[PDB]
Symmetry: D2
């Protein structure tokens, strides 16, 4: 089956345009279900996960059309409020329709997400918030059912600043009676994008991007036009590629405010970075300095760039420590890095990376979206040729990584 | 030597006035060193740790006077910029003079804190920030020396939102040339209190209480009058006491905004809480509901209330899980809770608390400030009598816990 | 694709015959490569992993024939000493040919195992032992190469009592010049089975089953007949099934000495167990008592029964704690147990299981061999019907689990 | 108060005689309580912990006399079976009288050990074994009471191969009616010493030093003469001192079988070691090679040498990883190593040691017995002078460390 073949490449040089954020667009597409009218989303990345959540909206009866990075949704005449097992199993972000469906029809039944490549990921905090708003919760044979005679705004505390729980609860709160306060909210940039979209539809959401979000419920929302933010994780991926290949890349159509920790840590590794209004230039160092990273809730270092930074560290000039505080099992890629000649030892949530002279091409498998991109970055610097399998992991969340890297001078080909 | 004797007590009832915050006043006292004039701090708690940092200020040549909860400092004529081993060993918050001394004299030499009761606690992030501002760092026989021809504002990223590092770097930045940006700053309420004090002295600090702090350096600061915020951890301690004893306590002179996670989790345990402008009323439930807690950076659940909430959980109606993400070894109290008949099992950063019918009085030792207060709370509900040793841990950070609990109806006595 | 459908079943009752051990037979099949003649293995289970290692032996030029639970190998005329990427990727126990091939031809080149469902699993200790015996190690593009002018016996210490490293090093040592001592050896029963087979072929291996193994090298080994031990993990699986279903099962063709920790913990859970010479009877309790388990090197509780014991605990009368010390990520099944209505929370290497009234059938996926068997056990007690996917995980390591459970009265069917 | 002053020293050279094992002699002294007559223990080290357990025996009514490394105990006329809070608080190994007292009088009441410097250390497995033998357990105000009409031999499984639980249960089993089997027993050398002593008194204990111990109860035991084994941890301490100081030390009156993991890892670090019948010679390398260690049950690497090996690693030529699997919080010394200029970072149970050019003398505090000895080893190689406080930690478990190191050429003095 399909492989990505990467060869030892030239230093990456040139400009790369970043697509719209996968992780902004998925909750914002769920949010269109809140409105009795037609929404228009611009800057939608042409990814399989976008087309899966689109098909879940079609399943509940919304009208969806996609063309040329625009998606329109008419949620005027939703029929059903069930998310079946197949669609949640395909893409767990499907779970983000639970808040809007509960808000629009006072009842929803959603398949409970199972195992995930990067850890055991409960959705207890989503349910905690729905219960706080007056929903009764019950489990039926793998489905979670939430129902109320009416949502009522309430204060609620998140035990962890969950991105998904913050999104799901903000969307349910947008149509509730009265004021909801989310304490210890996720501060991720996608939370601010979703809030901005809710407000464009007529909502009253304040404090997004801060540790406390206040939602004053409205009776009805209306479809609106929205420009999705750029993908800060895709941007980070190309910035690391510049660092690893001693390259010089200008990343275009980005927001520097969303990239702070990645810029800081790349500068600590020895990159020369020039931040501009709509773009950032990264010049890789001749010798990578070893750095430590610790993944944390935004604006701490993002777990979605952990595997890629770990890849950079495999050839750094000394010992780096990677601590993963956000996910339990997000080290499955380590054994694949080790096949390419890395020196990585893990215990608990920490991985000790002892820099080596160079990596050596090998047959490797992508284990998840971000680790697969990290294996491409390894392949760009590994002596010889690297063959990456299980490439659906990569292709679901990166637009045309082969064409983008090819335009920067790299040697990469997808083969079927 | 000295003991605290607690007996099985009546439900606590009445009002308790909360003192000024230990953890606001210690950095704010360090901050007085920045000013060439006289500062006046009101609402200073009469604690030994306040008198130790006072003696460190005297050692470097400030004029200090304490009376009736007011402390004045005249830092006009500081002489020396060394913090000796004895004073840092007595109280590691002594380390907070490093930023002001570096800012005022471009050189400082500070004993590096050693072992702490609650974990291995490096000060690497403090030094990272000082280096970012242009200080050269070197180690001399247990001392860390920082020196520059001049501090220059710079952007810097905290790998962890360290309270102390945020404080130390904000104070050094206040006199630097140009603008400092602290990314992934601590959002704790004491950070906002310190910033407000710096601004009263003439500084330019914005974003305190948010994930990013911008400091625009000034050439000179002037002594100012400051009212310290209330102790949110002392307040929380009395709120838990009300929960555990099925009592009804009004906690006076508090700020509800600073107590959000404790209020939320006590309500989840079944407390009836009434939040007012300057006070909160807590009515304990008849049956405590088991809850989980996870300690996190503010506004997540505070590690300084973890031992006390764990004590409440020892008699809850089921199984609670306590996860400590902020400190490594903050479970030393568990073996003392177990001596009183608790059922607590730990592995890694998690403690599983299986609620028991009641605790039984025993001889126990305080291991640290907050655990010792937790043993007092255990003693209030434990059948018979509890004798707590190593009471200096408690007395250093709580004003008159014996008199406050006695005024609420509890049976407690300090014996020498 | 293929599913296993399990329905709420009757209490399991009757007798089940246990097959030969997967984990004894795989190293013993590798061991046949040491001998210049024909070996005969009896009691070989008819499993896909047996047929994969058989095809690796064919690849290096051994003559292999399988019929009716007997496998014969003639290794007289081995040609090649390379284990290609495809075969190691299919089954990482392929790595166990490295010791015999190095011993027979003084050179071998073996694909380095990559990611595994249950964790990052390095083979550093195997290489440590080969280096101790005088092999030079080098990495070529995902392959590990070991070569020497001659193996020489030496003392070596295992940092962890690795099963695989103990096996690989014992087999390499069997033909080395002089005496090898393995300190901190694996004490697992399969180590004793392998040693017994090596000695039947003419080797000199003493102390297998103890913490120290001494091998006195011989010049040549000869094919021998060997009876493989029973599968203690399959036996344990049926013993747990009896516990969970309040059944009464006699497990036949087992060795009680190999089952000590499972017998002890099932008795602690309330089972009535009768140990006999060749069989054990398990009578499940009416109410399961909650127990804790901690996985450890033999004779501690086996990690290969952790998922199954966790499944039993999901309906126990209280709170059980499962600690996994042997593998890093062996909790991937938890999210699937939770889909069936379990109450399991994980942090680090510990899982807190809060017993529920009953499980509810759901669509679930096997994540690995032992977890998939655990989902079958869940399915036997879950209200309604359970549909298990990704069933190749199960079928590779269990002989006819559908027929065995059907003969005990359970409702189970494999559908294609 | 008292300090140990260590200066940068010459390479240690010469011979050092090792004392009798602290951890053999403490359970063997408890074991004398089993016998209705007079025991004679030779090779008893002149340590405070020996004199504390001696005073506990006096408290229950045994006749005890100590002179010149011989201790005699006449337990003929024991009166009482209570171990009071003061004595267990002074030394938790006091808990080892519980098994003998329960065996001799069918009742005992023992203060439950509280907090320990190196972790939360429950005694649940001791009680599990006593319950298995037919004792009823209950808690009274910090005391654990065990009582039976008669002990009856039974099979029992240790969830962890606890040294103390193995000792306590073996001693209780020695007078029980019938056969006790301890499954997953501690294999530590002190377990074999205790068993040998029990058998000298008339017991029937087989399998000590293996993973299974069988005790056939007898009606009465008689006092006996016993030679205690050498202290393998003291020996290891001097062997590390030779490694760290590039010295050449012959350690006399030792058993090489008890030192296997320490010898192996020191050889891996580059030491030249010559093992003899009663002694071992260690020649330190010119350059220490970095090694990893992982603490495990014997015969894995001992946790009691972890701090000392960590100290050696602080100046090794690269990165070493220390994993502590046996105790939770056994890293309290790291902050003291860091005061001396080490580069150690911890997360969870792992410490990453990045070797430095040299350590620098500083004021440091001993946190526990073995860490304090490790600070002496640091002090021997640290530039300048080191002053160690809280020296009672060291003095309680090492005989005349000042005189022994002085006789090997080191510069060390105890000052009062
Ligand atoms: C579609 C999308 O935007 N996906 C992203 C989103 O995931 P997602 O929204 O799932 O991530 P969360 O922030 O919820 O998860 C963070 C942690 O919280 C835990 N948790 C979460 C929810 C809950 O109810 N209970 C609970 O315990 C999770 O197991 C995890 O350990 O943020 C992650 C963290 O930056 C990214 O890696 C994902 O790619
Ligand atoms: C005087 C004062 O206000 N004390 C409080 C302050 O401590 P303090 O300011 O020491 O606490 P931090 O927020 O710095 O520590 C949090 C974590 O960060 C780590 N860290 C910190 C600094 C650094 O340079 N590197 C590093 O790794 C620490 O080891 C710890 O694990 O906040 C803590 C967390 O709410 C409280 O428990 C303390 O009582
Ligand atoms: C074919 C076979 O018999 N498989 C079994 C064998 O696996 P296997 O022989 O792989 O298991 P090991 O005992 O080697 O692994 C135990 C632990 O040691 C670690 N380790 C191992 C080797 C090494 O060189 N370095 C290292 O760090 C592993 O990552 C793991 O965490 O024993 C396991 C433990 O009972 C079982 O679950 C497997 O089903
Ligand atoms: C007097 C003596 O000989 N002391 C030694 C003995 O301690 P001790 O006998 O206390 O050590 P154990 O082997 O019992 O402890 C090992 C681990 O098991 C745990 N555990 C132990 C008992 C129990 O009932 N439940 C439980 O969970 C402990 O918390 C610890 O994490 O062996 C230790 C391990 O080599 C050494 O460091 C000690 O110096």
């Amino acid at each position: 089956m399909a492989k990505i073949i990467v060869k030892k490449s030239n230093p990456l040089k040139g400009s790369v345009k970043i697509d719209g954020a996968k992780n902004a667009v998925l909750p914002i597409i769920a949010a269109t279900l809140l409105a009795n009218g037609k929404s228009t989303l611009n800057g939608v990345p042409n990814l399989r996960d976008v087309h899966v959540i689109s098909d879940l909206l079609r399943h509940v009866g919304a009208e969806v059309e996609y063309k040329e990075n625009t998606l329109t949704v008419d949620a005027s005449n939703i029929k059903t409020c069930e998310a079946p097992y197949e669609l949640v199993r395909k893409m767990r972000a499907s779970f983000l329709v639970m808040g809007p469906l509960l808000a629009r029809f006072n009842s929803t039944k959603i398949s409970m997400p199972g195992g995930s490549a990067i850890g055991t990921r409960p959705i207890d905090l989503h349910l905690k918030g729905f219960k706080a708003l007056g929903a009764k919760i019950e489990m039926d044979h793998g489905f979670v059912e939430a129902a109320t005679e009416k949502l009522v705004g309430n204060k609620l505390y998140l035990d962890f600043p969950s991105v998904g729980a913050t999104e799901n609860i903000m969307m349910a709160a947008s149509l509730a009676e009265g004021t909801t306060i989310i304490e210890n909210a996720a501060e991720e940039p996608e939370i601010v994008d979703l809030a901005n979209f809710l407000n464009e539809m007529g909502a009253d959401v304040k404090g997004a991007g801060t540790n406390t979000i206040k939602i004053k419920g409205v009776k009805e929302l209306k479809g609106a036009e929205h420009n999705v933010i750029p993908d800060r994780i895709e941007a980070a991926t190309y910035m690391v590629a510049a660092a690893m290949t001693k390259g010089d890349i200008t990343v275009e159509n980005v927001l520097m405010e969303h990239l702070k920790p990645v810029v800081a840590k790349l500068r600590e590794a020895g990159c020369e970075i020039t931040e501009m209004d709509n773009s950032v230039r990264v010049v890789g160092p001749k010798v990578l300095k070893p750095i430590d990273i610790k993944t944390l809730p935004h604006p701490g270092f993002p777990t979605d760039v952990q595997a890629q930074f770990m890849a950079m560290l495999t050839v750094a000039n000394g010992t780096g420590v990677v601590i993963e505080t956000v996910f339990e099992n997000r080290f499955m890629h380590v054994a694949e890095f080790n096949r390419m000649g890395a020196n990585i030892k893990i215990d608990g949530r920490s991985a000790v990376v002892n820099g080596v002279d160079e990596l050596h091409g090998a047959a490797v498998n992508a284990t998840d979206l971000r680790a697969g991109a990290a294996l491409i970055l390894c392949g760009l610097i590994a002596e010889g040729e690297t063959q990456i399998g299980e490439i659906y992991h990569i292709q679901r969340g990166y637009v045309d990584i082969d064409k983008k890297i090819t335009a920067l001078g790299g040697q990469i080909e997808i083969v079927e």
